[PDB]
Amino acid sequence: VDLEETGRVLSIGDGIARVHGLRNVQAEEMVEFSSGLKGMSLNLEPDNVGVVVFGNDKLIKEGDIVKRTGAIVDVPVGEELLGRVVDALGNAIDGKGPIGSKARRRVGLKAPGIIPRISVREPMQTGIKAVDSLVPIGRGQRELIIGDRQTGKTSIAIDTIINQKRFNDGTDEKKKLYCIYVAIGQKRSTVAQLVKRLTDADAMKYTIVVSATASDAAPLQYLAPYSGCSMGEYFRDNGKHALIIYDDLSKQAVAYRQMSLLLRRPPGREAYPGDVFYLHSRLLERAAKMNDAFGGGSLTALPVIETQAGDVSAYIPTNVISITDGQIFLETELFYKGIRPAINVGLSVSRVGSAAQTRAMKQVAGTMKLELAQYREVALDAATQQLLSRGVRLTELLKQGQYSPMAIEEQVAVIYAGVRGYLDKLEPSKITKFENAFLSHVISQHQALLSKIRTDGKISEESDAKLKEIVTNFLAGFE
Amino acid sequence: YFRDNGKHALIIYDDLSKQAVAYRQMSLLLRRPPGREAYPGDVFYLHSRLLERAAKMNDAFGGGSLTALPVIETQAGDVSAYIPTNVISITDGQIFLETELFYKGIRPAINVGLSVSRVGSAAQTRAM
Amino acid sequence: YFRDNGKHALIIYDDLSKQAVAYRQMSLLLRRPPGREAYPGDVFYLHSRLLERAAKMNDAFGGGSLTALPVIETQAGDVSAYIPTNVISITDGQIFLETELFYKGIRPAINVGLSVSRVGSAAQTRAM
Amino acid sequence: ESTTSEQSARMTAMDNASKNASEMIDKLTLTFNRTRQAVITKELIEIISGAAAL
Amino acid sequence: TTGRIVAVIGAVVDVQFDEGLPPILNALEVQGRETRLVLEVAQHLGESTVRTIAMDGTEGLVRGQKVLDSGAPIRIPVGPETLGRIMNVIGEPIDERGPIKTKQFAAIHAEAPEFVEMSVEQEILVTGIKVVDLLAPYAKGGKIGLFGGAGVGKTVLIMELINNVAKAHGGYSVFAGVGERTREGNDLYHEMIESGVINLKDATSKVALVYGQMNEPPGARARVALTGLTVAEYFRDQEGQDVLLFIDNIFRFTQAGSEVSALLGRIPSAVGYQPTLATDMGTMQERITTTKKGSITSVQAIYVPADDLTDPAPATTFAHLDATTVLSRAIAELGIYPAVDPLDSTSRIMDPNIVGSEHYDVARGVQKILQDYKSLQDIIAILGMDELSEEDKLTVSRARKIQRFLSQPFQVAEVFTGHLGKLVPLKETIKGFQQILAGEYDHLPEQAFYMVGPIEEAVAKADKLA
Amino acid sequence: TTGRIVAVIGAVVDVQFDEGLPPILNALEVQGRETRLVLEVAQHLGESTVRTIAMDGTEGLVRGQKVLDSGAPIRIPVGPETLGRIMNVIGEPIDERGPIKTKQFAAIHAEAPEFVEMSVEQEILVTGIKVVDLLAPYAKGGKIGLFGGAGVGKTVLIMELINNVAKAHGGYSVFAGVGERTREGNDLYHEMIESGVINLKDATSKVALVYGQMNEPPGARARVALTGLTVAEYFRDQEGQDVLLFIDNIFRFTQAGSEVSALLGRIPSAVGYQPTLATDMGTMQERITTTKKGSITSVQAIYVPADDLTDPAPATTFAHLDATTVLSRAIAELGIYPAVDPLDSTSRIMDPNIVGSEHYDVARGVQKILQDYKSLQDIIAILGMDELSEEDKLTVSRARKIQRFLSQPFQVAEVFTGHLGKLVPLKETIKGFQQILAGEYDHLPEQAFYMVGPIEEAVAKADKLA
Ligand SMILES: Nc1ncnc2c1ncn2[C@@H]1O[C@H](COP(=O)(O)OP(=O)(O)NP(=O)(O)O)[C@@H](O)[C@H]1O
Ligand SMILES: Nc1ncnc2c1ncn2[C@@H]1O[C@H](COP(=O)(O)OP(=O)(O)NP(=O)(O)O)[C@@H](O)[C@H]1O
Ligand SMILES: O=c1c(O)c(-c2ccc(O)c(O)c2)oc2cc(O)cc(O)c12
Ligand SMILES: [Mg+2]
Ligand SMILES: [Mg+2]
DSSP states (O other): OOOOSSSEEEEOSSSSSEEEEEOOOOOTTTETTSSSSSEEEEEOOOOOOOEEEETTTTOTTTTTTEEEEEEEEEEEEEEEGTTTOOOSSBBBBBOOOOOOOOEEEEEOOOOOOOOOOOOSSSEOOOOHHHHHHHHHEEEEEBEEEEESSTSSSSHHHHHHHHHHHHSSSHHHHHHHHEEEEEEEEEOOOHHHHHHHHHHHHTTTGEEEEEEEEETTTHHHHHHHHHHHHHHHHHHHHHTTTTEEEEEEEEEEEEHHHHHHHTOOOOOOOOOOOOTTTHHHHHHHHHHHHBBGGTTTTTTEEEEEOOSSTOOOHHHHHHHHTTTTEEEEOOHHHHHHOOOOOBBOOGGGGEESSSSSSSHHHHHHHHHHHHHHHHHTTOOOHHHHHHHHHHHHHHHTOOOOOSSOOOOHHHHHHHHHHTTTOOOOSSSSGHHHHHHHHHHHHHHHHOHHHHHHHHHHOOOOOOHHHHHHHHHHHHHHHOO | OGGTTTTTEEEEEEHHHHHEEEEEEEHHTOOOOGGGGOOOHHHHHHHHHTTTTOOOGGGGGGGGEEEEEEEOOOOOHHHHHHHHHHHHSSSEEOOOOOOOHHTOOSSOOOOOTEEEEGGGGGGOOOOO | OOGGGEEEEEEEETHHHHHHHHHHHHHTTOOOOOOGOOOOOHHHHHHHHHHHOOEEOOOOGGEEEEEEEEOOOOOOOTTTTEEEEEEETTTTTOOOBOOOHTTTSSSSSSTTTTTSSGGGGSOOOSSS | OOOOHHHHHHHHHHHHHHHHHHHHHHHHHHHHHHHHHHHHHHHHHHHHHHHTTO | OOOEEEEEETTTTEEEEEESSSOOOOEEEEOOOOOOOEEEEEEEEEEEEEEEESSSSTTTTTTTOEEEOOSSOOOEEEEEGTTEEEEOTTSSSOOSSOOOOSSSSESSOOOOOOOGGGGGSSSSSOSSOOHHHHSSSBBTTTTEEEEEOOOSSHHHHHHHHHHHHEEEOOOOOOEEEEEEEHHHHHHHHHHHHTTTTTTTTOOOOEEEEEETTTSSSSSHHHHHHHHHHHHHHHHHTTTOOEEEEEEETTHHHHHHHHHHHHHTTOOOOOHHHHTTTHHHHHHHHSSSSSSSSSSSEEEEEOOOGOOOSHHHHHHHHHOOOOEEEEEEEHHHHOOSSSOOOOTOOEEEEEEEEEEEOOHHHHHHHHHHHHHHHHHHHHHHHOOOOGSSSSHHHHHHHHHHHHHHHTOOOOOOGHHHHHOOOOOOOHHHHHHHHHHHHHTTSSTTTTGGTTTTTHHHHHHHHHHOOO | EEEEEEEEEEEEEEEEEEEOOTTTTEEEEEEOOSSHHHEEEEEEEEEEEEEEEESSSSSOOOOOOEEEEESOEEEEEEGGBBOOOEETTTBBBBSSSSOOOOSSSEHHHOOOOOOGBBOOOEEEEESSHHHHHSSSSSETTTTEEEEOOOTHEEEEHHHIIIIIITOOSSEEEEEEEEEHHHHHHHHHHHHHHHTSSOOOSOOOEEEEEEEETTTTTHHHHHHHHHHHHHHHHHHHHHHHEEEEEEEEOOOHHHHHHHHHHHHOOOOOOGOOOOTTTHHHHHHHTTTTTTTTTBEEEEEEEEEEEOTTTTHHHHHHHGGHHHEEBBOOHHHHHHHOSSSSTTTOOTTOOOOOHOHHHHHHHHHHHHHHHHHHHTTTTHHHTTTGGGGGOOHHHHHHHHHHHHHHHHHOGGGGHHHHHHHOOOOHHHHHHHHHHHHHHTTTTTTSGGGGGTSSSHHHHHHHHHHHTO
């Protein structure tokens, strides 16, 4: 009977339901269909409500009853989601029962303004030699990961999640990082395989996985980043640190374009709507570093963007570059040649992470950045011959496998050997072999020196002499 | 009529480019939705159903045949434009003509590198 | 007024690129459906009717004249684009300037082969 | 000595010119296909906007 | 219930119902026709009116003509009885061999296997074809991009995959001809009959055939892939098989989607594709996967419009591919069959974390040597062969031997050649190529490795030659 | 009197009024909200309904919700009390420092100074930045625009200008964040507190801050420019003063307008933009000006979507500028910073009668040698250096040294350069390039000219290369 808290479907067809009644709904309020499907009040018009359906609109028919929920679109939030795989709405999909969630939070919340923030200053350690040294990330930073299909984009994110176990198993609460992986448009098998990988690494226990995959309806793919972001903001505001991965925003923008076109919004460049930048800007602004007065927490975002044939000049790629605080560009050419991670150093930046790089890394990395800069400029005199000799060797040092993220001190020990010239006499094909032999040696025999570097956060005059000792002793002991 | 009565027929459609234009006129003015190059969604179907009517009948059906040679006009060599794409993909092969071969003195201006019959040897005599 | 009272006038339209944009805005807001590049269908006519009023009158009509120098702004040097060719196709020739020439020190940066006067020596003194 | 040095250097110059050309080809192909896609999309949007305004 | 036609505009038909409306995706049977005319509900327009997409011609339809709501989506005969039979989009036999006598029916629209129903592990689906399994191996429940066209042994490769999957995995196959050219569907039919993978006499048939032909309306051509996939889903869900699903060809699936979308008045996206390009592709591809019960592995022939890999159609498709098999006309001309390009063909699971370190390093070693052999081919035509170093003479030898050991006689091609077909196990494939690299068969003549199965037959062929 | 919301779609809200209809541009106040929600009247739709644009989120609005006419357009605090304070689009403080207690309020909509109000005087503003001062020099009280695609250096360049120009300025400044990063605002604010241009205890603050960043809905981003500009207008006129106005990023105004334009029921223009792009920009830009009454020196960062300078938004901005600095991604990728395109950046005062013939000649000379180099680059890319005449090799070598000497280490970018920031006086800029052109350093290596200040530093760098 009631047309104030209830409506009836007039038409349904382009993923949008037009609803009669609902005279009392708020704009952006979640509504519920008789079939169990949730929707969002989008369009409030004199004679109808346009509702975005969060699911398969084959299940909705003309006549179907629709009820208000009274709630602006929100999602379940809090620490109970840790270890869970959920969909775009927060519904569990791992078959491990309901989420014992107590709190809830709107998906559309505006980002912190100017005052609550402070510049990033806490290291967000990836464990990836090339990133942690050349493109350091800070907690509260936004760093785009960008490149063609199959360039190792997701792997950068995964090794970063896995890396946090070292901090998350200790007692120091400041150094802990909770993780959120948002899967948008991906294959469901890829996601299932991914949580498997995180489980094996015992990384899943501190991870929320939000999943709107290739067969999930476009509005579910659109929603999913905001949902995971909300879950991330829970930590950001409660004095904790979270990391979120949007994998990927290219597939999200596609989904949004589908919705916008079906809504008959005027298409623009690449048939995208005019608000496709705002789509990503509002989301990524929500990754922030809070000052002490607002708890000191932070949310770090790693949006993933997929380029076509390395074209970073395209509309969506430039949109996101123009939002984040730098980018890690992964090149097909480098990946092909087996240079992995396939990071193009020249096209990569962290605009704000420098201040959040541990001093111990700065001492070895600042001269490596310089020696790599001198190297690309000469891609047979003794002066410029040393530049090519050093460059190829550092290139080998930054090569890294998957699922073996390194402690920051391990990385500096390895990079120390390179930047002080202890590799210059070795053949390039033997650098990878040297590193793995040199690494498990300093781990086994010299725990004190590494433990000291981590605690000091520096390489002291004492450590520098002790490190020189070991490297020279090992080099003459390496065959 | 010939195909169905144990006889063989050749048909030239000269050209299907112009036919498509004519149908586009009609769909647009009937206010059917425009797609690429303002062509409607049933234009592939239009041509596919015309060209599938060329056939080699089996002996139970008289053994007759209809062979079709559709003609398509390209614009500045763009075989990837909409109607060419459709008819290229529908047919069993293409004889590509080129202006630059033509004036080089290669006449008929057939590009032998690009032209193809997917039937092939099956349609040649042993001598040839 | 000068043209029709045995006097001579010169008019510069600086520039008709911006007037076409203004007219496009106006036409779209009047709900007149957009055409090529969102300009109205009659955007040629917008300028053709304007520039045709530049004219030389015979002695019976007073012998006066209006001379026009419309200005068009290209994008990335494309004189061959639509709006430019519209206006080029109206006037009695065009002076095409290029940045490449400009920076090379050819100033005025006139591209000779691409510029034309359609009146030619009839418009020059015998000496020139 | 001279033609032994010349035929090496011309072999190398021609090697480098062929490799440069090959890169310029791949680059211009990518440009062509970006322009190909834009022309198609632009042309469609012009059509859509005209139809919608009726 | 029963509705009436209120509008017909080409392949789009509007039906008004007096009581309950058929939900979207329901099949509707038009009454008063010579043959069956199925209409699939696409939208609820309001005012008790649905918009449908016709599965055949709408010539002759009257406003008012009665239309029966079937109550469900398009449901087709599924089961072992469809094998060796040809059906169309709506389940009808089109092979003139009478009714398809199945106990079960299945709706062609179904949702992808849920997240809990997913296999967390990646497995190779061994084909027994040396090039494939060694260098660009197939993944159980994955999708493979087949680049080829005519004359490159494509139909033979397909027919052999059908055969080898039945022989090695006990899996049946489904072939879905999306935009099948009628002529080629007939020829394909008889080639299968001639090769044995279809058998009209007994019941050994290994493939079921589903044709959505070129001259059919957009809707019909857009749905056949689902029809085929549904047939295949029976064998996974009900009989626990590692199934094979061929889609010929995926681009035409995309284009039919583009056409349907255009016909429903939906504003086209970039390059004129349907706004739902990715979801159309997503809701079909995600059905192809390994469940706890079994798997469907799909081989999908790919047309790349304008040779642009960045075109929305192939771009979207590539997101779903786990491997590519590239058939090369250059390779076939060298007499190498199957005509697989060993350097152009790739696989996502060529990863030691998946296939093992030994499979990996041998494949890489093979790739490396075939890469190296090419580098020396410019020096071959210039310096000649007897100017190379003792290391470089040996790489040329080994690479030439590797090229030939990658060729394989097919069982499905026995009639054409007389030569006995081979299905090489994965471990014998790895072993074989492992030993050529080591230099264990440098003394052997090069032609001994050609058109051979396991490495033991390379030895038996070498002994046989004078 | 009092109106009722009849429609809501994103930022666009229709309101029905029973008696009095609020004029276009009026600020309406939405009743029953926790935070102030302003709607600005955009259109009279007829039937006593107006169409409006919200200055904040519209989540939570219900049809029938009451709205009151404020009786005027959005009005904001202006005067001394704005200095050191941060305000938003509607003039609320956003720095948690309590009310901004001003005597005057000014409406954010106003008409552009008339023709007779214009200033025709031209005077160089020397920036200490080599490429700018030489090739496309800025003018005191002039309009300056910094064009660049994503990540190429717009904000760095504007911050270095604040460093190089604002620091030693005896007037007031206004910084308007428009659709940029909120953390950038946080950076700017705390940096200004560290330096003391903003003082949290004194009344010695010289900069007023206005922010409506990329976290704001379109209505807010579409109007913050007008707000920031209004603050500047007060200072120009009601103090007759020298005012600096920095806007980052003015493109975001046009993009914002674009997001709401469809919802306002306009037929779209080229590339989906609003049909009103040029006039919207005109009415806004024409207010950003020096008048007889006072000087505004304006610097506007201008984002260029998809690196396309012919895009309607940047394309339309050019004619609003007295000096353009066009940044180039290709120049940046070569490591040249600031990534200024020395052949696409222009200044209305690059005139021998204004800058003197020496400055003018060196500039034209540099530009000619760079253009000559550019014309040779097709030949160079295929065949290489070696196929050039000796005359061409000299142009190439001089041009390449000139390209490098156009680069400069910024104090603001020291982390990225690894060099100490430099400021080159104009006379020394002219001399350095005058000398390279004269052939005076044809003996010195390229690298010596890269990332240095004055020409002497290039020499000393050449010596250090031993
Ligand atoms: N450091 C590494 N060393 C060796 N192999 C790697 C490394 N990182 C990634 N890979 C491999 O490269 C492939 C692609 O990496 P992935 O992380 O999926 O990149 P992507 O761009 O996210 N792929 P997609 O999302 O499917 O386009 C995977 O199959 C990995 O096995
Ligand atoms: N003058 C410079 N010297 C050295 N590096 C620079 C300079 N300008 C820019 N960069 C580099 O480029 C990055 C982007 O600079 P920025 O000034 O933020 O560009 P932008 O055009 O404002 N980017 P966006 O706002 O995202 O479109 C910086 O973090 C530096 O790494
Ligand atoms: O650059 C582009 C462009 O300008 C236009 C466009 C659209 C409508 C018009 O009326 C017009 O003049 C241009 O569409 C595009 C579509 C793309 O997919 C990619 C692009 O890069 C453009
Ligand atoms: Mg990935
Ligand atoms: Mg910026």
